[PDB]
């Protein structure tokens, strides 16, 4: 937690139905975004940052949190935006001997600020003399080590949290989501939405021809009558339903 | 503990070899891990593939020791690796790495045996 | 996936001299890495494990600094016994990897 790993994602469509399996017992609590609608979203900006801390301390990952991860080992910004990610790793994160490769800053001058990392190892002086080196009384080691303890509640279990930071510009996006597919239904009068171009017709196999960066197909009333479907490369007509006056 | 190894002898190039790491005093646990590296005369130490102790073997591969080598666990207390096509370059000192942790891979080594080497000549 | 690099390749100080060798990795891997030192003839044994705690039977000297990418051993003293080779290993992922263990270091001191 106290080096905690940040990875870039970008330039891909973010699938959030896997994370399931991978992360059975997950708690998808999070702020800055309705989490239903993540799925038809776009991310312009994504960070991910995963570290492993004890239950007890799963609580302190959130924004305007005090606490000794939050001061010490990482700090979330008052307006954070994007969601975190926390599920139970007993199976995977406790040892039998003891599962003592994981630590945190435990003494430090003053709280981190946030989306800070501190990784010093200098010997913290808790007194008036100088430690000069020696760990002493009134000189603690400012890195304290996990004791995991499995058989006590899962505050005591280690806790594997992903967070997750985003920015939602959605114009210059580079992670977006899968949006899907509809059966096409032919040779009657539609309501169509082609990538946000909503529309009424009849919606006819068209023999036009139009070049591969060609999307859509215009007339001489300047209005939409041969489109491409995003879904299958193929082209339609656009005919407006059978109409007329009646007398 | 100790985990002296065997099969350890001049080979001809192109050829297979059986090196056996056998344990004393303990078993192949399944929630402790077991490696195999090697030390070649000249330059520092590498690792080239290994296989997890436990019911179900992790086994797990270097990149230059992809398809050569096999290793596969015989008895609790015993252990073998195998490698064909073996090469002028091939020849190294051999140790059975002994892994402190199963997260799936070469962890910290507390222990190793004494090692064996294998040398190639024509 | 990983690429660990160890440098300097040779050291040399006073028997009361200090040395120091880097361990550098491509990507982070936060607390994972470990120390190794080995005698010529004789195989090496685990020095500093997680980067900060040192083993047993070892004398307090052996220590470790840094995290993340650059991790460093910084040698107090040394007392004309402790010439050998120093390697660190990555133990943070291992998937593909052509060699978890790093380069070879070896320290001469001049007593």
């Known amino acids: 937690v106290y080096a905690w790993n940040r990875k870039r994602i970008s330039n891909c469509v973010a699938d959030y139905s896997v994370l399931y399996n991978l992360a059975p017992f997950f708690t998808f609590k999070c702020y800055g975004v309705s989490p239903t609608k993540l799925n038809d979203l776009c991310f312009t900006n994504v960070y991910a940052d995963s570290f492993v801390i004890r239950g007890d301390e799963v609580r302190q990952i959130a924004p305007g949190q005090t606490g000794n991860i939050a001061d010490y080992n990482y700090k979330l910004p008052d307006d954070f935006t994007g969601c975190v990610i926390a599920w139970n790793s007993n199976k995977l994160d406790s040892k039998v001997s003891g599962n003592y490769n994981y630590l945190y800053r435990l003494f430090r001058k003053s709280n981190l600020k946030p989306f800070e990392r501190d990784i010093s190892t200098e010997i913290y002086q808790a007194g008036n003399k100088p430690c000069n080196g020696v760990a002493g009384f009134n000189c603690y080691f400012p890195l304290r080590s996990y004791s995991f303890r499995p058989t006590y509640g899962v505050g005591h279990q280690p806790y594997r949290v992903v967070v997750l930071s985003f920015e939602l510009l959605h114009a210059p996006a580079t992670v977006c989501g899968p949006k899907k597919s509809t059966n096409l239904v032919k040779n009657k009068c539609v309501n169509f939405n082609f990538n946000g171009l909503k529309g009424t017709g009849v919606l006819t196999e068209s023999n036009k021809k139009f070049l591969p960066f060609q999307q859509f197909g215009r007339d001489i009333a300047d209005t939409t009558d041969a489109v491409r479907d995003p879904q299958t490369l193929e082209i339609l007509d656009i005919t407006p339903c059978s109409f007329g006056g009646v007398s | 503990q100790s985990l002296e190894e065997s099969g350890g002898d001049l080979v001809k190039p192109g050829a297979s070899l059986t090196l056996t790491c056998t344990a004393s005093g303990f078993s192949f646990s399944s929630g402790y891990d077991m490696c195999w590296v090697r030390q070649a005369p000249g330059k520092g130490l590498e690792w080239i593939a290994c296989?997890?102790?436990?019911?179900?073997?992790?086994i797990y591969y270097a990149s230059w020791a992809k398809g050569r080598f096999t290793i596969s666990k015989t008895s609790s207390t015993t252990v073998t690796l195998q490698m064909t096509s073996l090469t002028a370059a091939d020849t190294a000192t051999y140790f059975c790495?002994?892994?402190?942790?199963?997260?799936?891979?070469?962890?910290?080594?507390?222990?190793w045996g004494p090692g064996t080497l294998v040398t190639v000549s024509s | 996936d990983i690429v660990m690099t160890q440098t300097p390749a040779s050291v040399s100080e006073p028997v009361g001299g200090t040395v120091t060798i880097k361990c550098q990795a491509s990507?982070?891997?936060?607390?994972?890495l470990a120390w190794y030192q080995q005698k010529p003839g004789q195989p090496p044994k685990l020095l500093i494990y997680?980067?900060?705690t040192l083993a047993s039977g070892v004398p307090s000297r052996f220590k470790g600094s840094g995290s993340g990418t650059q991790f460093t051993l910084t040698i107090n003293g040394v007392e004309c016994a402790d010439a050998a080779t120093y390697y660190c290993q990555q133990t943070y992922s291992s998937r593909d990897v052509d060699n978890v263990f790093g380069g070879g270091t070896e320290v001469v001191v001049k007593g």
């Open positions: 790495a002994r892994d402190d942790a199963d997260y799936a891979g070469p962890d910290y080594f507390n222990l």
């Open positions: 990507e982070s891997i936060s607390n994972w």
């Open positions: 997680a980067a900060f």
């Open positions: 296989i997890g102790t436990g019911s179900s073997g992790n």
